[PDB]
Write an enzyme that holds these catalytic residues in place. Structure first.
Site, PDB file in Angstrom:
ATOM      1  N   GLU A  14       0.577  -8.037   0.782  1.00  0.00           N
ATOM      2  CA  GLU A  14       0.953  -6.675   1.169  1.00  0.00           C
ATOM      3  C   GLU A  14       2.468  -6.476   1.093  1.00  0.00           C
ATOM      4  O   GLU A  14       3.000  -5.443   1.528  1.00  0.00           O
ATOM      5  CB  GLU A  14       0.370  -6.333   2.554  1.00  0.00           C
ATOM      6  CG  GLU A  14       0.429  -4.888   3.044  1.00  0.00           C
ATOM      7  CD  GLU A  14      -0.025  -3.847   2.031  1.00  0.00           C
ATOM      8  OE1 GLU A  14      -0.931  -4.112   1.208  1.00  0.00           O
ATOM      9  OE2 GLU A  14       0.534  -2.738   2.089  1.00  0.00           O
TER      10      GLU A  14
ATOM     11  N   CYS B 299       4.834   1.341   9.194  1.00  0.00           N
ATOM     12  CA  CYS B 299       4.747   0.346   8.124  1.00  0.00           C
ATOM     13  C   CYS B 299       6.071   0.216   7.379  1.00  0.00           C
ATOM     14  O   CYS B 299       6.800   1.197   7.177  1.00  0.00           O
ATOM     15  CB  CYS B 299       3.620   0.698   7.144  1.00  0.00           C
ATOM     16  SG  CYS B 299       1.973   0.373   7.843  1.00  0.00           S
TER      17      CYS B 299
ATOM     18  N   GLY C 214       2.801   5.161  11.028  1.00  0.00           N
ATOM     19  CA  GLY C 214       4.016   5.452  10.293  1.00  0.00           C
ATOM     20  C   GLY C 214       5.108   4.408  10.481  1.00  0.00           C
ATOM     21  O   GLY C 214       6.250   4.588  10.046  1.00  0.00           O
TER      22      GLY C 214
ATOM     23  N   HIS D 250       0.807  -1.216   0.000  1.00  0.00           N
ATOM     24  CA  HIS D 250       0.000   0.000   0.000  1.00  0.00           C
ATOM     25  C   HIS D 250       0.846   1.274   0.000  1.00  0.00           C
ATOM     26  O   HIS D 250       0.246   2.347   0.035  1.00  0.00           O
ATOM     27  CB  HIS D 250      -1.004  -0.008   1.164  1.00  0.00           C
ATOM     28  CG  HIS D 250      -0.452   0.454   2.479  1.00  0.00           C
ATOM     29  ND1 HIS D 250       0.254  -0.375   3.328  1.00  0.00           N
ATOM     30  CD2 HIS D 250      -0.535   1.653   3.110  1.00  0.00           C
ATOM     31  CE1 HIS D 250       0.597   0.296   4.415  1.00  0.00           C
ATOM     32  NE2 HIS D 250       0.133   1.529   4.306  1.00  0.00           N
TER      33      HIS D 250
END
Length: 180
Positions: A71, A147, A145, A40
């Site tokens: 992902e 990720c 934040g 993403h």
């Protein structure tokens, strides 16, 4: 401590800040010019890495046999530097891990290393409306934040952080067959 040394060495040698239209993410180099980023992040034909523009030669959005996102997206970058090859530390199969850490280096979370505890195979969860497979789960109140952050300890690099809900974090499983 030797975990903090192995993990800080990983962050310093293989990780970079990737900036897209969707924000700042940690990028983990795996081997050669191949790095991993959360799907993403929506990386384009070129990506901002450590403030500089870098051409993406090839990207592969990784998926299971049923077309559901892991992902994890692989980036092949047009760069001269070869990442230190960390494939030997990536597990072959999904599995519970104890004493795991979450580590990232990003503007909200510089050189973060946080003890996440026990990590367990958790399967499919819908993240922001999108079905996501092969997730590992930890009982730690992660923040957005984070990720791309690496989930690891000494000798074991097992996931990248890809989601959370204020109580728990979800890591996309790193499997060695992705990088062969």
């Amino acid at each position: 401590g030797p975990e903090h040394e192995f993990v800080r060495a990983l962050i310093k040698r293989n990780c970079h800040v990737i900036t897209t239209s969707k924000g700042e993410f940690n990028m983990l180099g795996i081997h050669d010019n191949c790095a991993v980023v959360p799907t993403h992040a929506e990386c384009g034909d070129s990506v901002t890495i450590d403030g500089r523009e870098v051409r993406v030669l090839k990207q592969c959005i990784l998926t299971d046999t049923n077309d559901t996102d892991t992902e994890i997206t692989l980036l092949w970058l047009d760069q001269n530097e070869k990442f230190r090859d960390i494939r030997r530390f990536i597990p072959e199969h999904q599995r519970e891990w104890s004493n795991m850490h979450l580590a990232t280096n990003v503007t909200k979370f510089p050189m973060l290393d946080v003890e996440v505890g026990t990590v367990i195979p958790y399967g499919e969860v819908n993240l922001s409306g999108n079905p996501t497979c092969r997730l590992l789960k930890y009982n730690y109140p992660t923040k957005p934040g984070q990720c791309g952050g690496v989930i690891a300890n000494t000798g074991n690099i097992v996931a990248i952080h890809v989601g959370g809900n204020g109580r728990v974090g979800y890591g996309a499983a790193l499997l060695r067959k992705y990088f062969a």
